[PDB]
Ligand binder design. Sequence first.
Ligand SMILES: CC(C)(COP(=O)(O)OP(=O)(O)OC[C@H]1O[C@@H](n2cnc3c(N)ncnc32)[C@H](O)[C@@H]1OP(=O)(O)O)[C@@H](O)C(=O)NCCC(=O)NCCS
Ligand SMILES: Cc1[nH]c2ccccc2c1-c1ncc(C(F)(F)F)cc1Cl
Length: 322
Amino acid sequence: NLYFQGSKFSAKRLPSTRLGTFLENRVNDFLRRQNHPESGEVTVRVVHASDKTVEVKPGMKARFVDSGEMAESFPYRTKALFAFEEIDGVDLCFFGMHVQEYGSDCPPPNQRRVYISYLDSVHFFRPKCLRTAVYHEILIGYLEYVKKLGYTTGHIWACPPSEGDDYIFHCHPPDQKIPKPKRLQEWFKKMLDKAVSERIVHDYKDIFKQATEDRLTSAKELPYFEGDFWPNVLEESIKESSQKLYATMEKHKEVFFVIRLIAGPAANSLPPIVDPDPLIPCDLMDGRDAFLTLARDKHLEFSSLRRAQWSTMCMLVELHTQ
Ligand SMILES: CC(C)(COP(=O)(O)OP(=O)(O)OC[C@H]1O[C@@H](n2cnc3c(N)ncnc32)[C@H](O)[C@@H]1OP(=O)(O)O)[C@@H](O)C(=O)NCCC(=O)NCCS
Ligand SMILES: Cc1[nH]c2ccccc2c1-c1ncc(C(F)(F)F)cc1Cl
C-alpha cells in the first residue's frame, strides 16, 4: 500500500486517551449487544485539547466585573472529539463535537460545568437503524465520564444550523435532512431520559424552570461560555438600556437544557477535578473554523459516502502529521 493510504494514518492509530477509550468502549459494547451483522468497529478520538479563557465582554464587565461582583475571565479546556466507523476496511468520520470544560479551579458561576459548543454528523453510519442510538451512546458516555471526574452540571444549546450552514463537516449530503428546533429538542430529551434511567443524569430542566427554582436575580449568576447565545444577548440588553431576563429565558427555554449530573449535598464535598488526559495541541481542531476552512479550500466534502471517506482520509493524515 501507498504511504498515505497505509494503516499508519488510520483512525485507530490516532493517539489514545482515557476519554476516547471510555466513549468507544461504551459504543462498541452497545453495538455487540445488538449483534447486527453490517455494523463496524467504532473508534473515538480526542484530537484537540487546549487551555483557554473566556473574558467577560465590556458591557457586563462594566456592570459587574469593575464593581467586584464577577470575575473578569473564566478558564476552560476545549476538546474536539470525533467518532469513526470502519466500513468494509475504510475509515469513515461520521460524528464530531467540541466541548468546553470549566473545572474546579474556576470562579462562579462557571465552576464544574461542561458546555457542548458544537456537535455535527454525517449520516453514513452502518446500519442506519442504529445511527441515532450510537450518537446517544456517545453523548451519554461523555456526560458519564465528566460526571465521574467531578463536573456537576452540563449545558446544551439545541439550535439547528440555518439552511446551508455547516457546523463541523463541510458539505453535508443534500439528502441529510436538518431537523427543525422541535425535532432537535425532542432528540436531546430522548438522550437525556436514557441518561436519567442509567442514573448518570440526576435530572434536567429548561433554563426558565431552573432559574425560577434557583431564585436567580442577577445576570452575573448566569454561566458565561465562549461563543454562546447568552453573553451576546446581555451585551445587546446593556448597550440599549430581571423583568427582561426571565422574559428572555422563558421565550427560549425549550432550546437550553441544564443537566444536573451530581446533585445537592454531594456536590459540596467534591475533591478537585483531575483530568488524566494530556493537552493535545492541534491547530486544525481548535474550534470549528480551521477544519471548515481547509475542507472548503481543498474540496473535502462529506456529501456522499465516497466523498466522505476520501475527506476522512485527508483529515486523518493531517491529524497524524500536525
Ligand atoms: C443532531 C443530529 C446528529 C441528529 O441526527 P439523527 O440522530 O440522525 O436524528 P435526526 O433528527 O437528524 O434524523 C432522524 C430522522 O428524522 C428525519 N428528519 C430530520 N429532519 C427532518 C425534517 N426537517 N423533516 C422531516 N424529517 C426529518 C431524518 O430524515 C431521520 O429519518 P430516518 O430516521 O428515517 O432516517 C443531526 O441531525 C445533525 O447532525 N444535525 C446538525 C448538527 C446540529 O444540529 N447540532 C445542534 C446542537 S450544537
Ligand atoms: C447562560 C446559559 N447558556 C446555556 C447554554 C446551554 C444551556 C444552558 C445555558 C445557560 C443557562 N444555564 C443556567 C441557567 C440558570 F440555571 F441560571 F437558570 C440559565 C441559563 Cl440561560
